[PDB]
Amino acid sequence: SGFRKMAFPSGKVEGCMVQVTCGTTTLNGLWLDDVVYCPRHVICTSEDMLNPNYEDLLIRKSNHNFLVQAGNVQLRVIGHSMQNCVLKLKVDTANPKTPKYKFVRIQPGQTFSVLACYNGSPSGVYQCAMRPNFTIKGSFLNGSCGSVGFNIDYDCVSFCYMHHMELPTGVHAGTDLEGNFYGPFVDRQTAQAAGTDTTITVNVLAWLYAAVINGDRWFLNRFTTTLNDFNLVAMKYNYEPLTQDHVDILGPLSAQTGIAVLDMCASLKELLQNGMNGRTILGSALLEDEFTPFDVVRQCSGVT
Amino acid sequence: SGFRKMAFPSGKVEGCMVQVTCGTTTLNGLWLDDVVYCPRHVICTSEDMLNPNYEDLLIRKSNHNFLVQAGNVQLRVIGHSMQNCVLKLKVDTANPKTPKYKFVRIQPGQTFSVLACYNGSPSGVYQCAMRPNFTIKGSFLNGSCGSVGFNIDYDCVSFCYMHHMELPTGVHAGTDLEGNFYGPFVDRQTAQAAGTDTTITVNVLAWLYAAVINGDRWFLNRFTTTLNDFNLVAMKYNYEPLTQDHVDILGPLSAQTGIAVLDMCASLKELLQNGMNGRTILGSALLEDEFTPFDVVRQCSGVT
Ligand SMILES: *C(=N)[C@H](C[C@@H]1CCNC1=O)NC(=O)[C@H](CC(C)C)NC(=O)c1ccc(-c2ccc(OC)nc2)cc1
Ligand SMILES: *C(=N)[C@H](C[C@@H]1CCNC1=O)NC(=O)[C@H](CC(C)C)NC(=O)c1ccc(-c2ccc(OC)nc2)cc1
């Protein structure tokens, strides 16, 4: 077959997207059971975002100051509370389209599907990876806040991300479904910096395994390299260091293609030191790191 | 914001995917109203695919030889007919989740979202462009046949593609929802060739307009070029020729960024003649042509 960046089917997540309005600010919310989740900066006007005291701002707000809309139907808010940077709205109606769901906190290097929403209506879907500096490279316009990232395990939806803000470099930052920010960011219109972003090495190796599976084999040498010799070279080229845990995740991929992981590191070492010389790998002139080993096995088996 | 490859929300299409079994072959079908659509080679065994006579093969089949499954529920087939390369199954139950839909035949250069399915169950979603040689670059394993490509206009689903086969070069080919193949292909396990694939120039220019919008402006020169001088250079580098119709589609993008289309062609002319010198545009070391002018305005406005 081929290899493409693939997002999970967004059907179950679509039924949980609602519109949350507080004053003039409007963003998206997540309606699960009788609770609506949305970023807390919806209670902010344009001037509070520079330096907000969310404790004093939410104290002035009552239940009727929150307008929740599921389509053209208004939900009655009967309770509200603030958990970290996420504001929780209790409603009088349980969402009938609630799927089996979990609240998880992903780790750097893992991927998830993003459902970009505006005014509580789905607009598109794309796949995103959690960078080592806890940022993401998405597409988020005004009002996209409250859009959620998720994974799907057959019938269970693992919500893991909520969009909150954009950084000066154009990358995006957000929280989990418990309100805790990924990284050292705060929901305030101020100059915030992300760390030096590095390359997810275990994801590059998984992507190269997908290349060999699909036909692209010109980069395959027969040179070899120790796990330590590759790690010192990977640090020069701004790559995450490879641990034995990382080599075990690439195990199923190693035993299937007949390519030992240590030999895969040697081909990657040469590609990093000698460049690509204008060639392409899976239709790309750069080394992709947004494919986890799980994503490759996902696409090479059709988990459906 | 940022710029990403974005697929339409697959919620409405998910409710129309069923499993179609005939003998030992199993693929996916599209259940709209009381009709199920699926590729006709489901009536083929492994040996007929080399040289099938679908007229004689379907004549031996009756209604009860077709097993249609919507989840764990069996649909009763009460009628069947063959329209070009698509086999149509009339069922006794109208799909309650049928959205407002149309059957369209897209043109080369236009894009659509692909919902990859296996055994009638959705697996993932990604965006695909119709190459000038009427092929697509997707991800399709065994049993993925019957997966459909579609566009969404607010509440209307425009079905336009159905997957049928893979070519020797690894690219994929299929039909519209009327059974007519895109290109000069036939549903038979034989050596088939696609034409020389060329680059969709109007899509590259739209992608460069999205780059200027998002910050990437290093490629912006102030050189100029006539529509004819660019077309003769575009033919050397295997690019589609630009017509006045193409310049009109880039109009809204031209009047918004203050960059005339003729100046955009000059910057593209230099990028084609002088390379990229190791730089990147929107995080890519190649010129992307899978973004139509409509897709760029779609993402720069949030059509939702
Ligand atoms: C939510 N609807 C919106 C989505 C943002 C806006 C457009 N694209 C996005 O990703 N989020 C916001 O408006 C939030 C609201 C705060 C209260 C959390 N803020 C930002 O997204 C944001 C903050 C700061 C800056 C910024 C950039 C450079 C700079 O230089 C000194 N200073 C500040 C940008 C955006
Ligand atoms: C449908 N489930 C399946 C999807 C294909 C298989 C795996 N990936 C895909 O995209 N489609 C098929 O099995 C169809 C069935 C026919 C009857 C339409 N066939 C092919 O996909 C197919 C035909 C021919 C060749 C081929 C390649 C090289 C070659 O060299 C001489 N000769 C033939 C490959 C695949």
- Of B197, B225, B256, the residue that ends a domain is B197
- CB count within 10 Å of CB B115 equals 23
Q: Tell the residue number behind the tokens 């915030």, with chain if given.
A: A192
* Beta pairing class for A156-166 and A172-175: antiparallel
- Of A177, A197, A217, the residue that ends a domain is A197
Closest of B31, B153, B7, B171 to residue B96, by C-alpha: B31
CA distance A59 to chain B (A): 32
Q: What's the CA-to-centroid distance between A17 and ligand 1, angstroms?
A: 22
**Do A238 and A90 belong together in one domain?**
no
Residue A144's contacts (CB-CB under 8 Å, 6 or more residues apart) are A27, A28, A116, A117, A118, A163, B1, B302
Q: How many domains does chain B have?
A: 3
Alpha-carbon distance of A265 to A270, in angstroms, equals 9
What does DSSP assign to residue A239?
Answer: B
Strand partners, A31: A36
Mapping DSSP to helix (H, G, I), strand (E, B) and coil, where does residue B38 land? strand
**Do A2 and A110 belong together in one domain?**
yes
B137 CB neighbours in chain A (<8 A) are: 2, 4, 283
Q: What's the CA-to-centroid distance between B91 and ligand 1, angstroms?
A: 52
Residue A81's contacts (CB-CB under 8 Å, 6 or more residues apart) are A87, A88
Q: Compute the CA torsion angle A182, A188, A193, A194 (nearest 10 deg).
A: 10
B145 is known as an active-site residue: yes
- CB count within 10 Å of CB A84 equals 13
The interface residues of chain A toward chain B in range 134-193, judged by CB-CB distance below 8 A, are 137-141, 143-144, 166, 170-172
Mapping DSSP to helix (H, G, I), strand (E, B) and coil, where does residue B15 land? coil
Q: Is B95 on the interface with A (CB under 8 A)?
A: no
**Do A123 and A157 belong together in one domain?**
yes
Mapping DSSP to helix (H, G, I), strand (E, B) and coil, where does residue A159 land? strand
Alpha-carbon distance of A8 to B123, in angstroms, equals 7
**Residue A40 near residue A82 (C-beta atoms within 8 A):** yes
Chain breaks in chain A (C to N over 2.5 A) after: none
In total, chain B counts a number of residues equal to: 304
List C-alpha distances in Å: B30 to A107, A164, A294, B150, B177: 38, 38, 29, 12, 10
**Do A7 and A152 belong together in one domain?**
yes
Q: What is the CATH number of the domain that holds B288?
A: 1.10.1840.10
**Do A124 and A45 belong together in one domain?**
no
Closest of B107, B77, B73 to residue B89, by C-alpha: B77
Name which residue sits closest to atom 19 of ligand 1, judged by CA: A165
- Of B155, B182, B197, the residue that ends a domain is B197
Q: Tell the residue number behind the tokens 């407002």, with chain if given.
A: B100
Residues of A marked active site are found at 41, 145
Closest of B15, B188, B203 to residue B117, by C-alpha: B15
Q: Is A3 on the interface with B (CB under 8 A)?
A: yes
| Amino acid code (one letter) for B27 | L
The experimental technique used to determine this model is X-ray
Query: Which domain does B30 fall in, by range?
Result: 15-99
Q: What is the CATH number of the domain that holds A169?
A: 2.40.10.10
**Residue B26 near residue B121 (C-beta atoms within 8 A):** no
Alpha-carbon distance of B290 to A168, in angstroms, equals 28
Quoted resolution (Å): 2.3
**Do A190 and A106 belong together in one domain?**
yes
Q: Which residue of B has its CA nearest to A296?
A: B139
**Do A32 and A146 belong together in one domain?**
no
Alpha-carbon distance of B267 to B247, in angstroms, equals 15
Q: Compute the CA torsion angle B192, B196, B200, B204 (nearest 10 deg).
A: 120
- CB count within 10 Å of CB A22 equals 23
**Do A145 and A193 belong together in one domain?**
yes
Which of B26, B123, B166, B167 gets mutated to test ligand 2 (max ligand atoms within 8 A of its CB)? B166
Query: What are the E-state strand segments in B130-278?
Result: 148-153, 156-166, 172-175
The tokens for A203 are: 């994801």
Residue A227's contacts (CB-CB under 8 Å, 6 or more residues apart) are A242, A244, A247, A262, A265
B172 is known as an active-site residue: no
CB distance A143 to ligand 1 below 6 Å: yes
The tokens for A78 are: 């009967």
In total, chain A counts a number of residues equal to: 304
**Do B75 and B202 belong together in one domain?**
no
**Residue B249 near residue B269 (C-beta atoms within 8 A):** no
**Do A126 and A182 belong together in one domain?**
yes
**Do A160 and A185 belong together in one domain?**
yes
CA distance B244 to chain A (A): 30
The interface residues of chain B toward chain A in range 52-71, judged by CB-CB distance below 8 A, are none
Would the CB atoms of B123 and A3 count as touching at under 8 Å? no
Alpha-carbon distance of B295 to B128, in angstroms, equals 12
Would the CB atoms of B304 and A118 count as touching at under 8 Å? yes
| Amino acid code (one letter) for A62 | S
**Do A104 and A189 belong together in one domain?**
yes
Name which residue sits closest to atom 29 of ligand 1, judged by CA: A191
